[PDB]
Each structure stands twice: as C-alpha cells, then as structure tokens.
C-alpha cells in the first residue's frame, strides 16, 4: 500500500531536451524528429517586453541567431516558423531518441508530470495539476522556461505543457504544444493576475476513495444527499460543482470499495461542515484535490 504523488518516469523525455540561445537569452527547448519547439519569448530582450510584436521581431532573425546545444554538440537551424506562442525550428537532424508520442490539450482537472530544466539539461521532476483557474503550482526558477509537462499511455508520450512565465502570485503559466496558451494569458509584460481559483471536487473524491481503499475509513457517515443539495454547500466552500459525468467517473471506485458516490458526497459535505477536529486523512490534514480518479486507479490496484 501507501499513497504518494507520483510522476511518470522522465526517461523518454530527458532525451528530447536541448538548450536554446538567441542573444542575451537562454532557455530550454524540446526536440522531436527534425524539429525543436520552444517559447517564442526567447527572441526578446528586456525592453521588448512591455510591448513586443513577435511577427516583427522574428522577421529580423536569422538561423545564424539561434544557437542550439544538445550536450556539448550543437545543431544547425534550417527552417523556422511560428505557431502562436512557439517557434518551430527545423534542424539538420532528427533526434535518435525521439519516441512514440502525441500532442494533447489537457483540461482543467487532469494532472501531468513536469521535467524542470535549466540550460538544456534536466534537474528535477514533479507531478502537479492543471488548475481550474488555468495556471499551475510549479517550482520554477529563471531559465526554467522551455520545461515540459506530459503523461505516458503505455508507450506513447502525451505532450500537454510547455512553461513560459511565472505570475505575480508565484504560480506559472504556459501553453500546449500547438502554442495555444492555457488560460487568458499572453507573452507581454502587462498587469496580469491569476483569477481566483477553486478546488477540483472530482479529485478530492477520488482522493477519499484512496484513503478508504488503503484502509483509512473515519470520514464516512450513514447519510446521503441529492446532487443539488451537495453543490449548494460545495459552492460556499469554493469547490467546483459536481456534475453527473463526474459521478459516472467515480463509478468503478464506488464499485471497488462498495461506497455510493452520493454517500461519499455526504461524507465530504460533512467534512466541509466540520473540518477534521485535527486529524489525518491518508497523511494530510487538508483535503487533497491533485489526484485524478484515474491516478488513484493506476496507483491503487
């Protein structure tokens, strides 16, 4: 047993990290077949921020300008276009170590692993969730840009995140691998706030189903509640509303522990009402929204 936040093994991705430099800016980049992806924001300096035009700044750039390091070695740039917030840079070589893979846009609620790099080499890997307010809680220092997010499904790597910037709140913002940002954010330096966030109610519920399956059981109660009665409370405490699709998903978890979802919700309703009078649920003293029902399945049984 046991239950820890777990990140996919970073191996297959490690071999896709490269370093990119353009003037007084160095950030990481991702190298798939003969392509290298990274945040367009590389090609700016720190007066360009305020108000950069990217189409403009890019039309005065040569492949001469782009220094690509894969370890000691270096790669020539050939083509180079732009996808929303990302440069697609053609290079003289397809990556020996390019794996099977796709580009999916994850949805708020789903989770992914993050491989955090500096200067085109990785230094750390951690699991986190794609927040409902569209940002994420990462550990990211300057030079972190280019670092990617991702899942694994059998053998194929589902790519879903590339890190671009940190916000005034200390949270981070970035984009899928098509260049389209997650959330209402843009490459400029402007007045920009993380809109107030909420809690991933689907998740906390997957998380309680862990506790139970692991053997912890004190939070439950004889009651039930309608769905509509549950939400009324869930709103007050700043949680997402639970919908029927949610309730479907929890299907197999109620089927494994034999606990009706709407019962679980009664328990959660009760948990919100009362707190824990100080006590542990599966280690924590707070309610843990960063586990998918799906991750409680991979990891429990």
């Amino acid at each position: 047993s046991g239950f820890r936040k777990m990140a996919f093994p970073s191996g297959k991705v490690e071999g896709c990290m490269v370093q990119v430099t353009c003037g007084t800016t160095t950030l990481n980049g991702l190298w798939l077949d003969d392509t290298v992806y990274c945040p367009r924001h590389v090609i700016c300096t720190a007066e360009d921020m305020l108000n950069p035009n990217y189409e403009d700044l890019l039309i005065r750039k040569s492949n001469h300008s782009f220094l690509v390091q894969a370890g000691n070695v270096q790669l020539r740039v050939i083509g180079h276009s732009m996808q929303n917030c990302l440069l697609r840079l053609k290079v003289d070589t397809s990556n020996p170590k390019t794996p099977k893979y796709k580009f999916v846009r994850i949805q708020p609620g789903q989770t992914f692993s993050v491989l955090a790099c500096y200067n085109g080499s990785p230094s750390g890997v951690y699991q986190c969730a794609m927040r409902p307010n569209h940002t994420i809680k990462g550990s990211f220092l300057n030079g972190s840009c280019g670092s990617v997010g991702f899942n694994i499904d059998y053998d194929c790597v589902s790519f879903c995140y590339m890190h671009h910037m940190e916000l005034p709140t200390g949270v981070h913002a970035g984009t899928d691998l098509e260049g389209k940002f997650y959330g209402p954010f843009v490459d400029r330096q402007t007045a920009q706030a993380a809109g107030t966030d909420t809690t991933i109610t689907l998740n906390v519920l997957a998380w309680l189903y862990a506790a139970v399956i692991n053997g912890d059981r004190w939070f439950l109660n004889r009651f039930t509640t309608t769905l509509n009665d549950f939400n009324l409370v869930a709103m007050k405490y700043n949680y997402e509303p639970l919908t029927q699709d949610h309730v479907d998903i929890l299907g197999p978890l109620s089927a494994q522990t034999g606990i009706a979802v709407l019962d679980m919700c009664a328990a959660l309703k009760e948990l919100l009402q009362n707190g824990m009078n100080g006590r542990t649920i599966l280690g924590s003293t707070i309610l843990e929204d960063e586990f998918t029902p799906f991750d409680v399945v991979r990891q429990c049984s």
């Binding site: 030079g143 671009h164 910037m165």
Partner: peptide, 5 residues
C-alpha cells in the same frame, strides 16, 4: 508584475 522566465 509578471516574470517572462
């Protein structure tokens, strides 16, 4: 305000 990283 912000931090392009």
């Amino acid at each position: 305000n912000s931090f392009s990283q």
